[PDB]
Amino acid sequence: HGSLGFLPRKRASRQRGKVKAFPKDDASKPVHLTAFLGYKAGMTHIVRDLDRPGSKMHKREILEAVTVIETPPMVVVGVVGYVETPRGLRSLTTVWAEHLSEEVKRRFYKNWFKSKKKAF
Amino acid sequence: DIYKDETLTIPKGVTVDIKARNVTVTGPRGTLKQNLRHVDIEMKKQGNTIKFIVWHGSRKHNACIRSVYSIINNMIIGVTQGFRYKMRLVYAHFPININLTENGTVVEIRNFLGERITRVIKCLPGVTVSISSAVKDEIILEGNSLENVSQSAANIKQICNVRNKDIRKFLDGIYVSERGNIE
Amino acid sequence: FKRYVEVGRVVLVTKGEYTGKLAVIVDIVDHKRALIDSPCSEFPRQVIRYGSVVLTHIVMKLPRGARSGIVAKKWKAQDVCNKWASSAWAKKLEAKKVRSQLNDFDRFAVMRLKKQRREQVNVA
Amino acid sequence: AQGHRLYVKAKHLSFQRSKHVIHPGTSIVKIEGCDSKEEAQFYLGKRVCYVYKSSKAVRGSKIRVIWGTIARPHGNSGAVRARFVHNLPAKTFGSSLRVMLYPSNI
Amino acid sequence: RGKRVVVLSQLEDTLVVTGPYKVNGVPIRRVNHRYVIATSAPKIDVSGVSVEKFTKAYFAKQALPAERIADQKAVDAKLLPAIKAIPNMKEYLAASFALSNGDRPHLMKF
Amino acid sequence: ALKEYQVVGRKVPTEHEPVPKLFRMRLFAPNESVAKSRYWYFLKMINKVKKATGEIVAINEISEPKPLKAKVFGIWIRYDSRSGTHNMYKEFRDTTRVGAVEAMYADMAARHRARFRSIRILKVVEVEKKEDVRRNYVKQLLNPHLKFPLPHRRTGVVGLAGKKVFAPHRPSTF
Amino acid sequence: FQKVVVIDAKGHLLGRLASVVAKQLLGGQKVVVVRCEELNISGHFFRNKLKYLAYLRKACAFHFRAPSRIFQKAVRGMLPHKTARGQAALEHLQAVEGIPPPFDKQKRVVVPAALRVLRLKPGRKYCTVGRLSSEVGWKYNDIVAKLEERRKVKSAAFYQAKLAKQKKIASAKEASPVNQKLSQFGY
RNA sequence: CUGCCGAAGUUUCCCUCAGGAUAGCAGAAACUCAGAUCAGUUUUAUGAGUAUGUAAAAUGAGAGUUUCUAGUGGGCCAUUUUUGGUAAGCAGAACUGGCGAUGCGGGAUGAACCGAACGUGAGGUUAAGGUGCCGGAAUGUACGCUC
RNA sequence: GCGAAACCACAGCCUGGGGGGCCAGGCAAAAUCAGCGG
RNA sequence: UGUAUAAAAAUAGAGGUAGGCUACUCUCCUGUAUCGUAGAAGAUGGGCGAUGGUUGAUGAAACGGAAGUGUUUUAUUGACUUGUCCAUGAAAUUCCAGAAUCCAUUGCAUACGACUUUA
């Protein structure tokens, strides 16, 4: 059979990928982001020089399959706070922005148009 | 037996306090602090005598007395005049490159039997490393506590080892030369 | 270890029928049995273990194996009585003891006593 | 506030039982404070009540009381044995009881 | 319940008891000897007061008539000088008894 | 609780043996009746005098002459084991002769798991001379300058209450 | 016997504290334990580890690893947790990590019959449950230590304010002339 | 349906065959002595080889008889010797009990282990077993050994 | 839409001890659909 | 049915004490403590003494995130103000009781449910 670790082979409970593990914080480093979310569109193939030191294919031409993922710029709409607790990370509070993009309002509503758009 | 007493004559030092099973002994050289909760013992400091007493103790606890007495002697001599550990280098074919960083607290050794590893040793605090120019390959290990200096010497000795070869043919390595006080 | 089993140290018996009576160690039979006595006629000399007693600070000089009469002479000479009571440890025990044999009327007067003590609450 | 409570609290521990047989005829009561078998000699004979409630408003009170008597000391630690008019139900194991000071002996 | 009183006379098993009515408002009453907590407070003069006028028929069921108030007042008259003489007794009789928490009835005596 | 028992008895006189000899024993027993049983066991195994031809003339109990005087006792005993013979000689320091034997029963059944029937007491003697003492701990206990803190500090004052579940403060125990 | 009590678990023995606690729960008392990390077990540290790797080896169970979950397992073995008498006694026992805020303002009592010092011969090997579990799969050893230090700062600061306050009432106590009558009644 | 009584579970023989037996145990009726008549008992006296049998005071009990009429003649467990045996089990009898017809407490659980024989209930008190918690009952006392 | 029969003491979670019912443990949330072990 | 009480640390030791890192002295050896405690279930008044205490409503300000279940500084308020001393009343209770789904769409999904869309 396949890997025992990936068991059980049940369908994912999330439609979209969830980042369970994040890079460790470092106050010495400047503020920077860690994750992105785009959309997979398709793939093509590209021709690229292979500058691999010590390899037999060093400083020459190699063909590599590539994938194309469109990543339109997001809109930062809010921030959340997390507290390290003896029970793990706990959500302390959450603050948002004023003019939420209309697509975000679609996320909160299963039937947006029928709803009176009372979110936030 | 119900009692087992050990006596210590305090040398010059400055302070030999036994405050809360913690000898924060200060000598003319400096101050060192060690824990004493490892064993349950009566340690009295009075005049020029320190009394270590076992009451109704087993031989297992009795053996701790002389060990503590040997221990207590170590730093009190260290804080008075210090301790120096002389290190000698022996190489067969490939000369060994030794560098000292942060005034010798970290020692990197290079070119060991043809191997190309910059073996780095961050020596434990309280011990620093110096290279003696009076005699070549002579390395001085100065500190105020034998167990720390010796452990660093043991560590530098074990990282300076040979693998899957014959010991009686290869002679390169680092080994203990001798001990002594700073003065 | 200020509490030190020494020939002639005063001891205070905390278990057995002689609980609360003072007495002095006379001779060390072994690390689990000891011989104690007191001039007080209510306390006959007997061989008492170390489990029922707690050692006290006061120590009076006493030659080993002294008879009760000599011990009484030594105690009276060294005024150990009212020297134990000088300690703040002692003063609490009868304070607990005096409260033991109170009655209802004594308790009420105490309520009057403490209430008149608290009413001041005068602090600058 | 503290102008009441002329009784002594207790707990209905269990039935006086063998290892594998409960004898519901007599219960076990631990008076809050009793600490010896000689101590329980004081509480022997007193009257002990178990005060519970129910939805029915009998005579203008949801509160009911089941009477009982301390009968004899139980064990070496100061629990007693009680014989109530109605055997206390098995669901009151651990519930609270009141050993009122009467009938007195002083 | 919980009202400290003074016993007037012994009437077989029950006790003819009352507190100073001006103090605790306790009328002369019968109380069984099993429902009494006798205290060790100093004794009160009761020999001088009249007690012979108390019988089980007198207390038995046949709006309180006046002379029943009067003789109690007379008993108070013979009892007030004593409680006035001994300090703290008058208010102690007025005081109500209760069990403060953390108290062992067997140990603390009365 | 054992007692000292001076047990004296002799065999039943007859025409062959008109005047039996009075044997004497200083043996320990919890009651008078056990003293007789140990007596017959001690003597029959040794002198071979039958039970039915023996009568006992006097049972007396010996109170300790000077109980208040501390003493050191020498105790010769014979261990019975898988082998069944061991000349063991223990020494105990205490105040009462009976108390020393009690401890000897305490130690023999603790250190060596002995049994009262198996162990037969050989001789109990006083050791009046410190030089006559042979045990270092007793010798150390006999020194002029004895001094030691009360061992098992917790055993002193223990907890000192009736049922003190949930004490409100930590115990000093010092 | 208060309705709710808090048992500080620092220096208590896991087995002997649980047996005391399990009985109190069956008596109906709502017992809450705090500072379950600093519990103790008789036996050197590596021994108690191996007896725990047997527990993890036992598998089909749910080897709960947090120190509170270790103690709760200990109590669950001294209750009749199959029956509704013990099933309703288990839910009163609240064992926590360190001291949550709703309990750090409450007086914490200690069990004399199960303290480490009164029950272990001096020098005997023993292990701390908090350290043990942090080497079995617990992951919150460091955070509780940091949080406990912070509360110690506030609690110690609280005492100093209270210490001065009682000192004022200590200094003004002798001003009462009834102290002589207090002495006569031994109070 | 309730009540009362209540076994043997084995000899004896006969018997080609299966059995038949007499006896014992369990009963029912008819008749003697108020007995020194019996006893799963021990003494007294022995005689012979610490044991053995025998006859002749202690203790308890009312002991008897002739007549018929059922049921039964399996086995299991443990002790004594015991002769034959050996890596080691064993193998064989004679003997003694109890289970077999029997619930109950304890031994976590149990055919033989430890206690105990059962009308229906009340109180008292025990046995064996036990008193850290589950679990009724000392997180008792004392003296020791063990990491 | 029509529509059975076999079969049925009672039922149905596993480890260990004496199997599914006993003892001690582990656990323990309805109703159901589909493939499929014992 | 007083739902009264928050340092820590160690038990072969801690804390406090005043001065200039401490000398020295003191406390510990239990909570059998400390705090609160009357009133026909808490009445009506009268004085004497002190600027207090207790609360209810507040005006709040500050603090508390580990599960903040609250704490404090408090200005405020009008009560109650046993602090102490006096007078009136009890009683025959006469012995305990706005959203989401379906219908509809989509196909990133799909045995059927379900899931991702749209409407």
Tab-separated table of C-alpha atoms in Angstrom, chain F residues 28-158:
chain	number	residue	atom	x	y	z
F	28	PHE	CA	10.870	-14.991	78.894
F	29	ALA	CA	7.199	-15.466	78.036
F	30	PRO	CA	4.141	-13.250	77.415
F	31	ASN	CA	2.214	-15.060	80.171
F	32	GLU	CA	2.686	-17.718	82.827
F	33	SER	CA	1.373	-20.528	80.613
F	34	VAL	CA	3.821	-19.853	77.780
F	35	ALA	CA	6.656	-19.932	80.321
F	36	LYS	CA	5.735	-23.517	81.205
F	37	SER	CA	5.665	-24.516	77.532
F	38	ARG	CA	9.051	-22.963	76.787
F	39	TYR	CA	10.391	-24.547	79.979
F	40	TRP	CA	9.376	-28.057	78.938
F	41	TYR	CA	10.722	-27.428	75.437
F	42	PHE	CA	14.031	-26.046	76.724
F	43	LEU	CA	14.559	-28.890	79.188
F	44	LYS	CA	13.156	-31.902	77.312
F	45	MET	CA	15.310	-31.203	74.244
F	46	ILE	CA	18.332	-31.121	76.591
F	47	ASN	CA	17.892	-33.164	79.783
F	48	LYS	CA	15.189	-35.594	78.523
F	49	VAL	CA	12.779	-35.312	81.464
F	50	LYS	CA	9.273	-36.334	80.451
F	51	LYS	CA	6.339	-33.937	80.683
F	52	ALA	CA	3.945	-36.271	82.503
F	53	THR	CA	6.502	-37.067	85.229
F	54	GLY	CA	7.264	-33.396	85.911
F	55	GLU	CA	5.643	-30.847	88.198
F	56	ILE	CA	6.549	-27.189	88.632
F	57	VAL	CA	7.193	-25.872	92.119
F	58	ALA	CA	7.174	-22.089	91.579
F	59	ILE	CA	6.623	-19.466	88.865
F	60	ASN	CA	7.870	-15.988	89.773
F	61	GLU	CA	8.121	-12.761	87.780
F	62	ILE	CA	11.221	-10.592	88.183
F	63	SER	CA	10.696	-6.862	87.865
F	64	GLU	CA	13.744	-4.987	86.638
F	65	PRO	CA	15.814	-4.183	89.760
F	66	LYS	CA	17.095	-0.789	88.538
F	67	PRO	CA	15.037	0.082	85.442
F	68	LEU	CA	15.953	3.775	85.552
F	69	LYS	CA	19.668	2.938	85.200
F	70	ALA	CA	20.823	2.756	81.586
F	71	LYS	CA	22.644	-0.474	80.788
F	72	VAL	CA	24.264	-2.435	77.968
F	73	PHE	CA	23.108	-6.033	77.569
F	74	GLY	CA	25.006	-8.956	76.083
F	75	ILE	CA	22.747	-11.575	74.531
F	76	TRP	CA	24.015	-14.977	73.443
F	77	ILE	CA	21.503	-16.638	71.108
F	78	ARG	CA	21.360	-19.615	68.753
F	79	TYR	CA	19.915	-18.972	65.305
F	80	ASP	CA	17.931	-21.762	63.672
F	81	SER	CA	17.939	-21.575	59.871
F	82	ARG	CA	18.133	-23.907	56.886
F	83	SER	CA	21.278	-25.161	58.625
F	84	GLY	CA	19.811	-24.877	62.128
F	85	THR	CA	22.811	-23.784	64.219
F	86	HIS	CA	24.444	-20.348	64.502
F	87	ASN	CA	26.266	-19.091	67.615
F	88	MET	CA	25.170	-15.466	67.336
F	89	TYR	CA	25.901	-12.942	70.084
F	90	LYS	CA	24.097	-9.606	69.819
F	91	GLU	CA	24.396	-6.594	72.113
F	92	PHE	CA	21.776	-3.966	72.926
F	93	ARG	CA	21.852	-0.887	75.151
F	94	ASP	CA	18.619	-0.005	76.948
F	95	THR	CA	17.057	0.334	80.398
F	96	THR	CA	15.079	-2.878	81.004
F	97	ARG	CA	16.202	-6.474	80.566
F	98	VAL	CA	12.844	-7.327	78.990
F	99	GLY	CA	13.070	-4.319	76.683
F	100	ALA	CA	16.417	-5.487	75.324
F	101	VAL	CA	14.992	-8.907	74.458
F	102	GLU	CA	11.963	-7.302	72.790
F	103	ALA	CA	14.313	-5.391	70.496
F	104	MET	CA	16.319	-8.576	69.972
F	105	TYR	CA	13.108	-10.237	68.800
F	106	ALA	CA	12.470	-7.090	66.761
F	107	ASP	CA	15.889	-7.197	65.089
F	108	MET	CA	16.112	-10.981	64.669
F	109	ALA	CA	12.759	-11.113	62.873
F	110	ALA	CA	13.608	-7.971	60.861
F	111	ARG	CA	17.274	-8.328	59.910
F	112	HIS	CA	17.118	-12.109	59.649
F	113	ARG	CA	13.399	-13.074	59.538
F	114	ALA	CA	13.619	-15.371	62.558
F	115	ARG	CA	10.705	-17.029	64.368
F	116	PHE	CA	10.094	-17.157	68.114
F	117	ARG	CA	9.955	-20.958	68.233
F	118	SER	CA	13.101	-21.283	66.112
F	119	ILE	CA	15.177	-18.875	68.212
F	120	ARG	CA	16.203	-20.142	71.645
F	121	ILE	CA	17.690	-17.645	74.087
F	122	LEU	CA	21.061	-18.855	75.395
F	123	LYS	CA	22.091	-16.277	78.009
F	124	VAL	CA	21.423	-12.594	78.712
F	125	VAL	CA	24.139	-10.749	80.627
F	126	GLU	CA	24.841	-7.176	81.667
F	127	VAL	CA	27.895	-5.428	80.246
F	128	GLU	CA	29.076	-3.101	83.012
F	129	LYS	CA	32.444	-2.235	81.422
F	130	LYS	CA	32.834	-0.135	78.289
F	131	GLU	CA	35.961	-2.186	77.581
F	132	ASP	CA	33.804	-5.317	77.744
F	133	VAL	CA	31.578	-3.816	75.028
F	134	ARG	CA	32.546	-4.973	71.536
F	135	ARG	CA	30.292	-2.926	69.216
F	136	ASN	CA	31.569	0.293	67.659
F	137	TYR	CA	28.165	1.994	67.583
F	138	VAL	CA	27.594	1.088	71.233
F	139	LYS	CA	31.175	2.162	71.955
F	140	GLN	CA	30.435	5.437	70.172
F	141	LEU	CA	27.140	5.706	72.069
F	142	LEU	CA	29.120	5.221	75.300
F	143	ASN	CA	31.492	8.120	74.587
F	144	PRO	CA	31.692	11.016	77.084
F	145	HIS	CA	30.753	13.629	74.466
F	146	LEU	CA	27.583	12.259	72.873
F	147	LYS	CA	25.781	14.837	70.726
F	148	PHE	CA	23.491	14.608	67.695
F	149	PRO	CA	20.458	16.431	66.270
F	150	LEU	CA	17.163	14.617	66.688
F	151	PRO	CA	17.145	12.275	63.679
F	152	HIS	CA	14.114	11.954	61.413
F	153	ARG	CA	13.204	15.606	61.866
F	154	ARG	CA	9.738	15.007	60.404
F	155	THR	CA	8.989	12.375	63.052
F	156	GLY	CA	9.281	15.110	65.646
F	157	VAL	CA	6.063	17.169	66.034
F	158	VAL	CA	4.826	15.173	62.967
